[PDB]
Write a protein that binds this ligand. Structure first.
Ligand code: NAI
Ligand code: FMN
Ligand code: SF4
Ligand code: FES
Ligand code: NA
Ligand code: NA
Lengths: 418, 155
């Protein structure tokens, strides 16, 4: 059928795995997927025990592609130590600034995700799975609904899948404008028909999630890896990139680069190589001033030689690379980040609620040169005090990137103080 | 207040889709906004009954989720990203071109009720900045001439 218009995001791969089809900016339906050996991994998995599938995913070193980098096999193991029923959730809320890696899987190769969801659901003994896709991805929603019907038609979903005795239905829920609904416990609250208010953790969803039952939440890109682990085996999967941070990774690159788009690269790729080797360097060959890792971290021009892996000295996060060049005002950019957090705090926690608002309100006065001495000292104080009592990662990091700009670009901030 | 049957049928479908009726609330509110060009306050009492939820639950959900609008009927929502990357790559040029063509600013509706500009956070098509949506359709802004063509397709 006809889907809503989607910008044709550039996609390029050195590995030809996650982007084997998704490098072409169009829907790949089940026949094209089946032509490339699609759903043969699912058939292989259904002839293995759930325990064996968990072991392979564990041994693969697969880590959470949603941005926290939690070991995927280890998450699954925690779930299956708890009595059922269990639920599997695909987090497709993708709302971090500069982060458009998941949407090109959903919109272009939806069967890669669906095959991933079926194998993972089988592995953890979940007979009911959910995709929660953000409201502002309507095309992704219709593409997934149609893809799931294709899968049903071919007997990859429903009861007794391929004579295995494994039953699965995948339900597609839509968000309605909240960044916070991507936080796994807020997502679960939204799936239950409520406001997206994060839950105090522990318990983690794997212990108490959807209707209080053991629940695995995994990112789109994480799940998309599962068919490759089963198809190749974990040993071969681990040959891709460095053996400690193995597998393909999607790097969404935007801002002041010549070739903005998504790059499928191994995680031993450096930040400098992503910008200059793959994304074609900077617009007008201007010097890199900073890289925003979404709204999470700010890297200076002195930090471009870091691996794009989940190591302590690594880039980590979503792999999101927003490039600022020498003429981009860091305080203006900091203001845009403050405005984001102001708009998205759910308000449950007092220092998050007032701090996200005050950080944005004071930084705007600073940017416009209307800040009193009190507002300056106020801004510094609130930036340092959004985190206390926070029950989710939003409050924990709402000041992080802006603090990093204060420490890495003090001369620019001082201009705004005088 | 009663839902027209063609709308009620869709709402019932969504309510029958998930294992529990209350899981359908966001899809139902999307469906209501799609039909009326906003959420009419009067629609929430009948929806609560179909969802078997208290009204105050349903009203709290509509208030929480930024896509739902109870204030302004608009046939077409021009969602304009005002986040970091689109701001760097020319959100202001896009807003200027929208005012030149339609005569309105963020938050405002055209006098015919056809177009409302909705400032939104990152739509995550940042490589194609600056980004906007017209209802479900999503585009890179190139120039006023290109924007005029795109808007010409919404009648
Ligand atoms: N992709 C996107 O669009 C967005 C991504 N993010 C990312 O979200 C990240 C923060 O996420 P969180 O879920 O708060 O991180 P986290 O590190 O607290 O948790 C990561 C995952 O591991 C699980 N986990 C952690 N400790 C566990 C334990 N002891 N037992 C069992 N399971 C455990 C959690 O349940 C979760 O599924 C950031 O790094 C950011 O990059 C944030 C917003 C949007
Ligand atoms: C405020 C907030 C928003 C989040 N949004 C998303 C999101 O859109 N997508 C996502 O996959 N993870 C998101 N996360 C991370 C999830 O809580 C969770 O770590 C992840 O979905 C688990 O999958 P993974 O282990 O495969 O990375 C968010 C976290 C926070 C604190
Ligand atoms: S830290 Fe902020 S976003 Fe997270 S639950 Fe508390 S108030 Fe809500
Ligand atoms: S910053 Fe506008 S789409 Fe991401
Ligand atoms: Na096709
Ligand atoms: Na084996």
């Amino acid at each position: 059928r006809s889907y809503p218009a989607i910008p044709r995001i550039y996609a390029e791969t050195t590995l030809n795995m996650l982007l084997k089809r998704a490098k072409k900016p169009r829907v790949h339906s089940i026949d094209e997927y089946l032509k490339d050996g699609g759903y043969q991994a699912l058939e292989k998995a259904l002839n293995m025990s759930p325990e064996e599938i968990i072991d392979w995913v564990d041994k693969s070193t697969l880590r959470g592609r949603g941005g926290a980098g939690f070991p995927t096999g280890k998450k699954w193991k925690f779930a299956v130590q708890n009595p059922g029923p269990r639920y599997f959730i695909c987090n497709a809320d993708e709302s971090e600034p500069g982060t458009f890696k998941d949407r090109i899987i959903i919109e272009r190769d939806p069967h890669l995700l669906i095959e991933g969801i079926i194998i993972s659901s089988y592995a953890i003994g979940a007979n009911e799975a959910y995709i929660y896709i953000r409201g502002e991805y309507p095309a992704g929603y219709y593409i997934l609904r149609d893809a799931i019907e294709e899968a049903k038609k071919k007997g990859f979903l429903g009861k007794n899948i391929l004579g295995s005795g494994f039953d699965l239905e995948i339900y597609v829920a839509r968000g309605a404008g909240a960044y916070i609904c991507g936080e796994e416990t807020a997502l679960i609250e939204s799936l239950e028909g409520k406001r997206g208010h994060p839950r105090l953790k522990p318990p983690y969803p794997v212990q108490k999630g959807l209707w209080g039952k053991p629940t695995v939440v995994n990112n789109v890109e994480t799940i998309a890896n599962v068919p490759f682990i089963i198809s190749m085996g974990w040993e071969e999967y681990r040959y891709i990139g460095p053996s400690d941070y193995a597998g393909p990774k999607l790097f969404p690159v935007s801002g002041k680069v010549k070739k903005p788009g998504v790059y499928e690269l191994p995680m031993n790729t450096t930040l400098r190589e992503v910008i200059f080797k793959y994304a074609g360097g900077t617009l007008g060959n201007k010097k890199v001033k900073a890289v925003f890792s979404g709204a999470l971290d700010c890297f200076s021009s002195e930090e471009l030689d870091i691996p794009m892996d989940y190591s302590p000295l690594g880039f980590g996060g979503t792999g999101t690379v927003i490039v600022l060049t020498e003429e981009d005002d860091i305080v203006e950019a900091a203001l845009k980040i403050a405005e984001f957090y102001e708009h998205e705090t759910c308000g449950q926690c007092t220092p998050c609620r007032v701090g996200c608002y005050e950080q944005a309100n004071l930084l705007e006065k600073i940017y416009k040169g209307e800040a009193t001495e009190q507002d300056w000292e106020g801004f510094d104080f609130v930036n340092r005090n959004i985190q206390p009592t926070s029950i989710c990662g939003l409050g924990a990091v709402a000041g992080r990137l802006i603090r990093q700009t204060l420490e890495k670009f003090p001369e620019e901030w001082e201009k705004y103080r005088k | 207040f009663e839902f027209p049957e063609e709308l009620k049928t869709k709402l019932q479908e969504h309510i029958n889709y998930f294992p529990k009726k209350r899981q359908a609330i966001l899809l139902c509110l999307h469906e209501i906004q799609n039909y009326y060009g906003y959420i009419p306050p009067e629609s929430l009492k009948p929806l609560a009954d179909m969802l078997e939820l208290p009204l105050n639950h349903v009203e709290g959900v509509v208030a929480f989720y930024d896509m739902f609008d109870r204030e302004d009927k608009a046939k077409y929502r021009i969602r304009v990203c005002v986040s970091i990357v689109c701001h760097l790559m020319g959100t202001n040029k896009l807003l200027k071109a929208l005012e030149n063509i339609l005569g309105i600013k963020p938050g405002e509706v055209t006098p015919d009720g056809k177009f409302k500009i909705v400032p939104v956070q990152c739509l995550d098509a940042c490589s194609e900045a600056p980004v906007f949506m017209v209802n479900d359709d999503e585009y890179k802004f190139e120039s006023e001439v290109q924007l005029n063509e795109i808007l010409s397709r919404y009648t």
